[PDB]
Amino acid sequence: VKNFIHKLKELKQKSLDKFANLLYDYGGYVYDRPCTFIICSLICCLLLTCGFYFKEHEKDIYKLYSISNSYAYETNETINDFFYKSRRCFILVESNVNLLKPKILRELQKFEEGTKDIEVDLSEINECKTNSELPPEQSHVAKELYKTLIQRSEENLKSGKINGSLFDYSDLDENGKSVNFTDYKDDVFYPYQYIPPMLIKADRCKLQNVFGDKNLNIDLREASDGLKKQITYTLEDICEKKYGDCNFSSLFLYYEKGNGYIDYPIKVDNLDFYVNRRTYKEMMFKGILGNMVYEKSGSKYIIKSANAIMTVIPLLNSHTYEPYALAYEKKLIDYVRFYNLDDIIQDEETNDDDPFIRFHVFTDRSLEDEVDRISKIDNLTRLLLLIGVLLIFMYALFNNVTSVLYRSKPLCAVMGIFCGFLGFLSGSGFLYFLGVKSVPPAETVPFLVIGVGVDDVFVILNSYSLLFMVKDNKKRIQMCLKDSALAITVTTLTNIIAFLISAISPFYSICAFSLFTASSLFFGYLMVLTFLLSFLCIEAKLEKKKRNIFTGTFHLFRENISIYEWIHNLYLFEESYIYEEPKGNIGKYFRSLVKNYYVPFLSSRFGKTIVYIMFTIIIAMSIYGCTLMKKGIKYDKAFPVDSYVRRFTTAKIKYFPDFGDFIEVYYFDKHFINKYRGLEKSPKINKNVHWENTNLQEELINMHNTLESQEFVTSVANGFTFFLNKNKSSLRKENPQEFYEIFANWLKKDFVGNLFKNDFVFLNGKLVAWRFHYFQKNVDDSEISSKWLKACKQITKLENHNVQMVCFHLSSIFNETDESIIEVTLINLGITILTILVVTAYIIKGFYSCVIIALIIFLIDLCIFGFMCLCGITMNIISMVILVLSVGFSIDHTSHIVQAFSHSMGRTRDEKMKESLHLMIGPVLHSGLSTWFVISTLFFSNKDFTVIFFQTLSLVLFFSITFSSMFLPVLLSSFGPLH
Ligand SMILES: CC(C)CCC[C@@H](C)[C@H]1CC[C@H]2[C@@H]3CC=C4C[C@@H](O)CC[C@]4(C)[C@H]3CC[C@]12C
Ligand SMILES: *[C@@H]1O[C@H](CO)[C@@H](O)[C@H](O)[C@H]1NC(C)=O
C-alpha cells in the first residue's frame, strides 16, 4: 500500500501539472480572441440576471431564525388545535404627566373611543381577494363530526341541563376506550359553547361565515373588488364580547354606566377584583395602569397620578378571523403610532422636567413587522455598500497604476471590480431560478462577494508582473495562468465547500445565505476566468505595443522557468537585468519594500522571538476571552431604537415591574388528543388521570402554592384551585361523575367559573384538556427567563399522580434556539474542519504542511472567538455563520501562503520562507485590504445584523492577515516542512 500511496501522491502532482497545462491552453485560447469571450460572458451573465424577475422573498421570522424543533412547534399546534386563544393588542399610553387630570382623561377617552371607531374594508385583506384560493377542505367525516357537535351544542345550550349519569367513567384502556364516525360520535363537550378548534375549519372567504351580522351572505373571494371595498367591518365585528358587550380591558370600564366620572377622582376597593356593579364587570387596576404614584386610603384607593396607562384589546384568534384580525391590527398600530395628543399635554406638570405621550403599541404580528424593519435593506446600508465598492475600486486603481503608464493596468482593476458584482448577479439569478427565496442577511451577500472576487484579481495580476521577463506577451499570459490558476481554483473551491457546510445548518436564513453566497462566488470565479482574463489579455496586448490606456483610447478614437525558480535564482544571485524588474511593474515597488525590511525582520531570530511573544500573548488574551464567553443568549433579537415594539417593551418593564410574560400551562389527555389528531389526518405519563382523587387535588393546590412562592412568578390565575377551594367538602367522594357535575355547575353558575369558562373542556365529563395562566416577572436577560421556564416545567410536573403540565410562551422558541445556537455552530465548525482538512490533504504537496494548516486554522478560530467575546459581541447567529465564512476566507489566505512556501525553493528553510514572502505577500495583503475596504462602511448600521457582522468579519480578517503574514511565515521558517 505504501507503494500505492506514493504512486497516488505522484498521481496528485501529475494531475496538478495537467491542470496547469489545461489552464495554459485555456489562456492561449482566451488570448486568441478576448472580445468574443467578453461578449459571451456578458450575455450569459445577463441571462442569469434575468432570473431576478422570478425572485421571491421569505420573511417569516421563525423560518429564518429558529431550530424549528418538533417539540415547541408541536406544542403550539396542539394548543391552537384544542384550545381557543385571544390575540391581545396592548396600547401603553406612557407619559411624564399625571394622566389623571380631567382634561387629559377626557382626551384619553377620546382616544379610547377612536380605537373602537377604527374600521377596515373587506378588500384590504389579502385572503379576501378573488385571486386568493381556498385551502383543501376538512375531512368529510370530520365535517360530519363538526355538524353533530354544533347540533348537540345548540341542543344542550337550549336545554341548559348538566348531568353525568349518561356518560361512562370507566378508566380508559391503552386504546382510549372502555376511522369510523361512530368512534368520534356522541362526544358530548362541556362547556356546551365549545367545539375543538382543529375541527373549526370552513371557508373564511364567505362574509357570512366570518360576519353573520351583515346578513348579506356574500363571498369575498367570489365578488367584485369594488364591492369588497364597500363592505367594511369595525372593531366590534372582530372583537370578543364578554357579557355580550365587549371583552376589552381598560380604565374606562370604571366609567361605564355612569359609575365613574372623568372629572371626579377614583376610589375602588380592590386592585385586581374591583367590579363595576353597574356593569357587573371587574378590572385589574394594577394591570391597567403602571408606575402609579397613586394613593391608597385603606380599602379605597386614591388614584391621583398614574403616569403610565395601558389598555388591552382582545381579538378572536380563530383561523377564520385571522386575516381580519391582522388587518385591523395593522390599522390599529397606525391609528396609534401616528396618533398624537401633544396639545392637551402642553403646559402641564412634568416629573422629568417636557410632557411626552408616546402611545406605545404592540400586537402579535408587530414582531414580524420589526423583522421586516430589519428584513428590508436600509437605503443608508445600500449607500454604504456603494461607498465601500468605490473605496475598493480606488484602492485597486491605485495599486494598478504605476510610474510607467502603458505598463500599468487600471483596466484590469476596473473590470475586476465590475466582475465581482457581475458574479454576484449571476449567482443571485441562479439561486432565484432554483426557487430558494431571499433572506435579510443576504444584504451582505453582494459586498462581501465583490471583495472575494477582487482578491483573485490581485493574484493573477501579481503573476503577470512576476513574468516581466517574458518577451512574448501571449506566452507571458499563458504562464501567468499556468501558475496562479491552481491557487485561485483552490481558494474558490475551499470557499464554496465551507459555505456549503455552513448551508447544512438547519436555520433556513443561514442555509439560504450560504447557498446564495457560494453560488455567487462560483459564478464570480467563472466570470474571472473568462471576463477579467480577457480584459487582462487586451491590456497585455496594449502594453506589448507600449500603449498607455489614455494613448490607447486616443488611438482607437482616431524560457519556461518557473516563477518560484526565478525568485530562488534571484536570491542565489544576491548571495553569489534578468532579475531586475522594469520600472513601473505592478508590484515591483511593494515587493522591494517588503524584501528590504519586513523579510529580514521575519528572517531574524530576534524578530522571530518578538513575533512568537506577541502571538503567545494574543493566544492568552484569546483564552481569557473564551473563558469570558460574553453572553450566551441574546436579549431582544437585536431590536433597534426605531422599533415601537422594543420601545413598548421597555415602557412595560419600566412602568409594570409586577407584570412580565403571560406564561400558559396546559394539560392534554393523551387519548382525546391522539383520537382527534387521528381523525384529522412512558405511555402512562398522561394516558388517563383520575382527577377525582383527593390526593391529586392536594398535589395540584400544592403546585399552585409552590408556583406562587417562586420569586419570579408574579401571580397565577389557576381557576382549578379556586374550584377546589370552593367545593372541597363536596369533593370528599371520589366519584368522577359528581366531580364533573360539580365542576360544570361551578363553571356555569359561579361568576368565577364564568371567568374561567374557556379554560376547561370535558369529553364525556372526563376533563380531557385544561389550562391555567400566570404572570411572570419581567426581565431583560433571556437566560434567567429560560431558567425560570425550566423551573416552572419542573414544578408543574407532578409525575407522582401520572400528571405532566406543559408550559408555553412566545419567547420559549427563542430561548430554545439560543440554547443550542452554540452547539449547532460547534458541530458545523467540526464538519467544516473535516472538509477543509480533506481538501488541504488533496491540494497540498506535503502532509506536514496539511497538519500545520489545520493547527493554524484552529488557532485562528480560537483567537477570533476569544477576541469577539472580549469586544462585547454575544452569541448571535450572524456571528456563528460569519465565523465559518471568515474561516473559509482565512484558510484561502493560509492555502495561498502554504502553497507559496511549499513550492518555493531554497537551501535554507528561512530562505524558502523569504522567497515565499517575496512572491506572495503582496496578493494576500491586497486581498485582505480590499475585503476590509468593502466591509468598512458597515461600521455603523441601522440594525445589529450588519454592524455586528462588520465587527466579526473585520476582526477575523485582521487575524487572518496577521497569522498568514507573521505567525505562519515564522512558523514555516523555523519549523516548516523543509524538503
Ligand atoms: C380570589 C379572586 C376572586 C381574585 C381575583 C382574581 C384575578 C386576579 C384573576 C381572576 C380571573 C383572571 C383573568 C382570567 C382570564 C384572563 C384572560 C387573559 O387573556 C388575560 C388575563 C385575564 C383577564 C385574567 C386576569 C386576572 C384575573 C382577573
Ligand atoms: C340526568 O341524569 C340524572 C341522573 O344524574 C337522571 O335523572 C337523568 O338521566 C337526567 N335528568 C333529567 C333528564 O332530568
One-character DSSP codes across 536-557: HHHHHHHHHTT--HHHHHHHHH
Residue 268 domain-assigned?
Answer: yes
Say if residue 414 is in the same domain as residue 271. no
**Method for structure elucidation:** cryo-EM
Q: Which of 376, 398, 420 is a domain's end point?
A: 376
CATH classification of the domain holding 396: 1.20.1640.10
The protein residue with its alpha carbon nearest to ligand 1, atom 4, reads 273
> CA–CA separation, 522 vs 453, rounded Å?
10
> CA–CA separation, 897 vs 918, rounded Å?
11
Say if residue 285 is in the same domain as residue 382. no
SS3 state at 261: coil
Say if residue 616 is in the same domain as residue 705. no
**Host domain of residue 297:** 84-118+235-376
> What is the number of the ligand 1 atom nearest to the C-alpha of 715?
8
Which of 155, 165, 739 is the pocket-test mutation for ligand 2 (most atoms within 8 Å of CB)?
A: 165
Q: Which of 339, 360, 376 is a domain's end point?
A: 376
- For the CA of 765, the nearest ligand: 2
Residue 144 domain-assigned?
Answer: no
Residue 263 domain-assigned?
Answer: yes
Say if residue 290 is in the same domain as residue 341. yes
Please indicate whether residue 131, judged by its CB atom, sits closer than 6 Å to ligand 2: no
Residue 368 domain-assigned?
Answer: yes
Which of 239, 253, 283, 284 is the pocket-test mutation for ligand 1 (most atoms within 8 Å of CB)?
A: 284
CA-closest candidate to residue 656, choices 717, 718, 714: 714
Report how far ligand 2's centroid is from the alpha carbon of 734 (Å). 20
Which of 273, 286, 315, 757 is the pocket-test mutation for ligand 1 (most atoms within 8 Å of CB)?
A: 273
Report how far ligand 1's centroid is from the alpha carbon of 250 (Å). 14
Q: Where are the alpha helices (DSSP H) in 194-264?
A: 207-210, 225-230
Say if residue 501 is in the same domain as residue 513. yes
Residue 755 domain-assigned?
Answer: yes
Report how far ligand 1's centroid is from the alpha carbon of 283 (Å). 9
SS3 state at 803: coil
Say if residue 352 is in the same domain as residue 497. no
Instruction: Kindly state the cell numbers that stand for 79.
Output: 394548543
Report how far ligand 2's centroid is from the alpha carbon of 744 (Å). 15
> CA–CA separation, 975 vs 619, rounded Å?
19
Residue 24 domain-assigned?
Answer: no
Residue 39 domain-assigned?
Answer: yes
Cα 11 to its chain centre, rounded Å, is 46
Say if residue 349 is in the same domain as residue 393. no
Report how far ligand 1's centroid is from the alpha carbon of 717 (Å). 6
Say if residue 802 is in the same domain as residue 827. no
Report how far ligand 1's centroid is from the alpha carbon of 774 (Å). 9
Helices 410-434 and 445-466 pack at an angle, to 10 degrees, of 140
Please indicate whether residue 159, judged by its CB atom, sits closer than 6 Å to ligand 2: no
Q: Distance of CA 339 to CAs 120, 221, 347, 354, 745, Å? A: 17, 33, 19, 18, 46
Please answer whether residues 72 and 813 qualify as being in contact, where contact means their C-beta atoms are separated by less than 8 angstroms.
Answer: yes
Bridge partners of 313, per DSSP, are 89
> What is the number of the ligand 1 atom nearest to the C-alpha of 756?
14
- 830 CB-side CA count, 13 A: 6
The protein residue with its alpha carbon nearest to ligand 2, atom 6, reads 165
Number of C-beta neighbours around residue 849 at 10 A? 21
Say if residue 919 is in the same domain as residue 950. yes
Instruction: Tell me the torsion sign for CA atoms 594, 597, 603, 605.
Output: negative
Helices 445-466 and 877-903 pack at an angle, to 10 degrees, of 10
Residue 592 domain-assigned?
Answer: no
Please indicate whether residue 717, judged by its CB atom, sits closer than 6 Å to ligand 1: yes
Q: Which residues contact 898 (CB under 8 A, 6 or more apart)?
A: 844, 849, 852, 853, 968, 972
Strands of the sheet containing 289-292, edge to edge, are 93-94, 306-309, 289-292
Q: Is the peptide bond before 736 cis (omega within 30 degrees of 0)?
A: no
Say if residue 389 is in the same domain as residue 528. yes
Instruction: Kindly state the cell numbers that stand for 401.
Output: 497604476
The protein residue with its alpha carbon nearest to ligand 1, atom 24, reads 717
Please answer whether residues 686 and 802 qualify as being in contact, where contact means their C-beta atoms are separated by less than 8 angstroms.
Answer: yes
> CA–CA separation, 586 vs 466, rounded Å?
9
Q: Which of 376, 392, 426 is a domain's end point?
A: 376
Please answer whether residues 522 and 57 qualify as being in contact, where contact means their C-beta atoms are separated by less than 8 angstroms.
Answer: no
> CA–CA separation, 505 vs 491, rounded Å?
22
Q: Where are the alpha helices (DSSP H) in 687-732?
A: 694-709, 719-726
Say if residue 469 is in the same domain as residue 606. yes
Contacts of 817-821 with C-beta under 8 Å, sequence gap 24+, read 817/65, 817/66, 817/67, 818/632, 818/633, 818/634, 818/782, 818/786, 818/875, 819/633, 819/786, 820/67, 821/875, 821/877, 821/880
Helices 366-375 and 322-337 pack at an angle, to 10 degrees, of 70
Resolution (A): 3.8
Report how far ligand 2's centroid is from the alpha carbon of 486 (Å). 90
Count how many domains the chain has. 3
Say if residue 741 is in the same domain as residue 794. yes
